[PDB]
Write a protein that binds this ligand. Structure first.
Ligand code: NI
Ligand code: NI
Lengths: 128, 128
């Protein structure tokens, strides 16, 4: 068994695709529409769904906002360069909630940011 | 770059750990506790953190309930036997919201369940 994906509802599909791919470096793997139930999907990721976990973005026609709640935490991604991502993210209008820097008591560089819908993302700069 | 984990706040750590490991077949990869911030964590997954995406279960001391909200969707996992999985889940702390079966106009078998805290999980099956 394997973990396939994490699905998040977004208020604007393209805005989200633009962010994940252009700002975070993922690729748009596939997209679909469901006319019957009025929603669209997009899968974004760093590699093929067959080999690894990705993100499923769901856009319900006409719905631009959701209630985030207090349960869901975040998604953590390995980042090539934390500082730069924060910069890209910021200048790209986003919010950096935790500037890049070594984590408390450790050495690993991490940062926290928010996507366009306010979801939190943890960036961690990390057989063979 | 890769997806590292998805973090979910849980009302009872062991309760969550038992569900993901005993019912879903994941393994407990690591744990930690932090007095400053008052929480404990458990990482569960089908492979080590360096090979796969996993789940970060967060238990905030003395907090046993959160607001799920309407934004967060689910986590999808592959399974060998959706029907069997559903049964195991419904009988061990979970709930089945969508019985195993093919998707309209498809043949791929899927189901939707809820874990002990209400989080949705999508089960995707991989001549009887
Ligand atoms: Ni995390
Ligand atoms: Ni899904």
């Amino acid at each position: 068994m394997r973990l396939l994906h994490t699905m998040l509802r977004v208020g604007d599909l393209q805005r989200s695709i633009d962010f994940y791919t252009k700002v975070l470096g993922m690729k748009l793997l596939r997209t679909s529409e469901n006319p019957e139930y009025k929603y669209s999907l997009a899968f974004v990721g760093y590699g093929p769904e067959t080999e690894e976990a990705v993100i499923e973005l769901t856009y319900n026609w006409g719905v631009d906002k959701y209630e985030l709640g207090t349960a869901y935490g975040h998604i953590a991604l390995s980042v090539d360069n934390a500082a730069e991502a924060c910069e890209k993210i910021r200048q790209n209008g986003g919010n950096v909630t935790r500037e890049a820097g070594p984590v408390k008591g450790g050495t690993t560089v991490i940062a926290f940011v928010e996507d366009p819908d306010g979801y939190k993302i943890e960036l961690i700069e990390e057989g063979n």
